[PDB]
């Protein structure tokens, strides 16, 4: 109650009153544009965003006159911290303007990237059509020119732009009293507390490192079962002891392994639960899909939807001629206004998406009595985690049987459960090593632990040892392979996908104990349990007004991240995988093998010597295939690949065919061609 605190209380009560009106106007304009895309609507949106930005910047300068050390109230103190953040205003006018130009260039380069075929120049592809190839194709050579093409055109442009991005972002972070831009990102988890509720920014690297080593035995057994299946699709392309080639993982980056299910399904004869035909035989519309989600939330004790939800949402794709981009989103406009934007088909996937989106609405409605600035999830991982927990319960055969969507005599066999749990692990367990390695890399780049002369060297060393994935061709420091991903080129933090998974299975396990479930976790349904929905609701009401470790303890009874709940959920699959791999499959990988290692020639001095060396090799190949093979093959210096370069001059190299990067010229023929032109080339060859 110091004069400062008394003064800060009057300041925060006037801001909250004015922000409710301006936020609603800004969000209403943004909704009108996204559901009805016209040029007239695109200017009303920008006018309202300008009004909010003018007001907020003026209020942040007023907030700087109340020192935080004089505020003893934690609710007052958390609101002032949000308003006092300086952001990019710590840089000069030129430096601030340069950083916004780099951010717009990098996202434009990514979204207009276009690759096409070395053997058919007239057909060229954008990212949408290249991703169809990576998710469906079983042709080794096709997946390789798509994988290498995306890196070679898009990734090589962003390398100069990313080096400037890193220097500018570190200057901004230091101007806000952080060590670097990675320290700045890790501040999303930092909290203060009195009795063990504090959490520092260095604690997040330690906790993420410790959880990763606990899930690695399960990831190693899934890696070994997937590797042995991939050896039948791609004979002689995969070592039984080594890493998995990066272009064969079912998408462009290897983030998710879900598109490998047709190749790895434990029991192909037994099909998976799909109820789309039952919804059509009972003539469900898209309204009834959302009426079933509302009945689910009311069965655990949560409120219904407001009257305006049904009148104002966009639950089907319009047929009045309006242009929209279909992507499911939940909207919290304020003033008791909640809307869902979704294009709903009568399928099982849209039935589960509706439950996920309505979970976000239920969280927003719970913390709507907090001050405006504290109206958020406890941290960046709690919101999505809550949505996922609700979707686990409604996808169970127990829940679907109770809805009439499964036959009344439906029985579940243990072979259908192994099919279900493998498909879950290709998503949830497959992506955890991927997410951890990318954040570990970015954090080390912002520190300076990796100099920019070793960016791609460290990227593929980490891929080989943490992920068990090897690059099909060697990439030097003219590439930037991390930046070819959307979240890296668009400046998005990525560790939220790690934490969300950990919190989702902690939440799930707590609620199934309160619901009194007997048996495995994956069969648990919390529907019709008002004691489970009341325990969930006490965490949801808090918003961002408490430490996230306090909101975690409210529901789970512990203050710490914990991976044992995740390992309990996947325990029936872990038992089956050890019988499969136990002559079975070797478990683990070697970071020595590569798809190109056995054909390399070791040569035992700046970069202009390389370009001359590769042309000497390229000429020697071209003459050998004419004077011995009687063929005219236009080998170039781009068909000579230099790898494994030491400071002392010692490197390796191999030659590929000018049109077919899958075809590596045998080490025997390359040696003979060098011997023929040994005079003109001149250099010890090992």
């Amino acid at each position: 109650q110091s004069t400062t605190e008394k003064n800060a209380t009057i300041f925060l009560e006037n801001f909250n009153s004015e922000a409710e009106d301006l936020s609603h106007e800004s969000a209403l304009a943004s909704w009108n544009y996204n559901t009805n895309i016209t040029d007239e609507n695109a200017q009303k949106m920008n006018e309202a965003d300008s009004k909010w930005s003018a007001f907020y910047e003026k209020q942040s300068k007023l907030a700087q006159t109340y020192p935080l050390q004089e505020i003893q109230n934690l609710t007052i103190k958390l609101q002032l911290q949000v308003l006092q953040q300086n952001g990019s205003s710590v840089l000069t006018a030129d430096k601030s303007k340069r950083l916004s130009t780099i951010l717009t260039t990098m996202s434009t380069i990514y979204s207009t990237g276009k690759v096409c075929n070395p053997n058919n120049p007239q057909e060229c592809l954008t990212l949408s059509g290249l991703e169809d190839i990576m998710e469906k194709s079983k042709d080794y050579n096709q997946r390789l020119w798509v994988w290498e093409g995306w890196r070679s055109e898009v990734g090589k442009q962003l390398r100069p732009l990313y080096e400037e991005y890193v220097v500018l972002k570190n200057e901004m972070a230091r101007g806000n009293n952080y060590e670097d831009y990675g320290d700045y990102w890790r501040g999303d988890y930092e909290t203060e507390g009195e009795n063990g509720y504090n959490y520092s920014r260095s604690q997040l690297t330690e906790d993420v490192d410790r959880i990763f080593l606990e899930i690695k035995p399960l990831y190693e057994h899934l890696h070994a079962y997937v590797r042995a299946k991939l050896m039948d699709t791609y004979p002689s392309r995969i070592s039984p002891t080594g890493c998995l080639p990066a272009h064969l993982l079912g998408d462009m980056w290897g983030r998710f392994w879900t598109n490998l299910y047709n190749l790895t399904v434990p029991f192909e004869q037994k099909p998976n639960i799909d109820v789309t035909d039952a919804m059509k035989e009972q003539s469900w519309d898209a309204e009834k899909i959302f009426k079933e989600a509302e009945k689910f939330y009311m069965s655990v004790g949560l409120p219904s939807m407001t009257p305006g939800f049904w009148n104002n949402s966009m639950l089907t794709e319009p047929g009045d001629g309006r242009k929209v981009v279909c992507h499911p989103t939940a909207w919290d406009l304020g003033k008791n206004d909640f809307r869902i934007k979704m294009c709903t088909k009568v399928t099982m996937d849209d039935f589960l998406t509706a439950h996920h989106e309505m979970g976000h609405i239920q969280y927003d409605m719970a913390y709507a009595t907090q001050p405006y600035l504290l109206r958020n999830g406890a941290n960046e991982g709690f919101h999505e985690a809550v949505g996922e927990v609700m979707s686990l319960s409604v996808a169970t055969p127990k829940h679907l049987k109770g809805m009439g969507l499964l036959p009344s005599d439906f029985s579940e066999d243990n072979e259908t459960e192994i099919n279900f749990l493998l498909k879950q692990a290709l998503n949830i367990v497959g992506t955890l090593p991927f997410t951890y390695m990318l954040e570990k890399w970015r954090w080390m780049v912002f520190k300076g632990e990796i100099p920019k002369e070793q960016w791609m060297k460290k990227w593929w060393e980490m891929k080989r040892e943490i992920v068990g994935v090897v690059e099909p061709l060697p990439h030097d420091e003219t590439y930037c392979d991390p930046a070819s991903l959307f979240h890296v080129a668009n400046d998005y933090s990525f560790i939220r996908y790690f934490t969300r998974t950990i919190f989702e299975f902690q939440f799930q396990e707590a609620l199934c104990q309160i619901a009194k479930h007997q048996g495995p976790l994956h069969k648990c349904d919390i529907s019709n349990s008002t004691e489970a929905g009341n325990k969930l609701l006490e965490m949801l009401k808090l918003g961002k007004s408490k430490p996230w470790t306090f909101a975690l303890e409210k529901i789970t009874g512990t203050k710490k991240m914990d991976a044992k709940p995740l390992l309990n959920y996947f325990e029936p699959l872990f038992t089956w995988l050890k019988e499969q791999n136990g002559s079975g499959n070797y478990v683990g990988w070697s970071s020595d093998w590569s798809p190109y290692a056995d054909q390399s020639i070791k040569v035992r001095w700046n970069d202009n010597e390389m370009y001359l060396f590769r042309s000497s090799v390229a000429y020697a190949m071209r003459e050998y295939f004419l004077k011995v093979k009687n063929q005219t093959i236009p080998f170039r210096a781009e068909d000579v690949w230099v790898n494994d370069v030491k400071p002392r001059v010692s490197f390796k190299f191999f030659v590929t065919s000018p049109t077919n990067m899958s075809d590596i010229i045998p080490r025997s023929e390359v040696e003979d061609a060098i011997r023929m032109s040994r005079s003109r080339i001149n250099l010890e060859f090992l």
């Binding site: 800060a8 209380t9 009057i10 925060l12 009560e13 909250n16 009153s17 409710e20 009106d21 609603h24 609710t75 007052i76 609101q79 409120p303 219904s304 407001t306 009257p307 305006g308 406009l333 003033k335 008791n336 206004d337 709507a368 009595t369 907090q370 001050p371 504290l374």
Partner: protein, 194 residues
Amino acid sequence: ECDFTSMLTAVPPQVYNFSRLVFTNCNYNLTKLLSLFQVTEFSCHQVSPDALASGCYSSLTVDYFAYPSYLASYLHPGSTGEIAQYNYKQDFSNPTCRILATVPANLTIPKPARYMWLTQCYSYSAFGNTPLYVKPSQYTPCLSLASQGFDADSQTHRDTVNKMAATGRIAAMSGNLQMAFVISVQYANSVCPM
């Protein structure tokens, strides 16, 4: 000889500002009171539609307001919606009947411009909002704020002295007028039918 004229010769109020008729020492005809309208709902509670007009009561009460019919589900007091939260909570301590009707184009009841109701009512501070909930058979504490009316959706009137705020929603007055009647009797030979 109970009079229902004051129910028919003026514009009806909104749900947060309901009017109340309490009849004592008169004889009623509920069949004559309703045949004038188009009853589209008669859900009752510890009483029945046929026993509603039959009985003799210590007292009789009628609450009535303009009400769109598509919001019929939210008028039940056991709802968690805004109508029961901020506008009108029906008292289940006595036998009550809920009647939704339509005013025919022959009836010359003056129409209001639109339907109005509250979506929020709370006290504000630097520490968040506290919702103000209406008590059974009573009036919202935001009545003084709400009296002025609402012309748009999500429009807020603030009382800067007591630090209270109210938010309203509107609906267009399309076609014939629609209203709602909530009839509650108590137990006793004063109030009787013919």
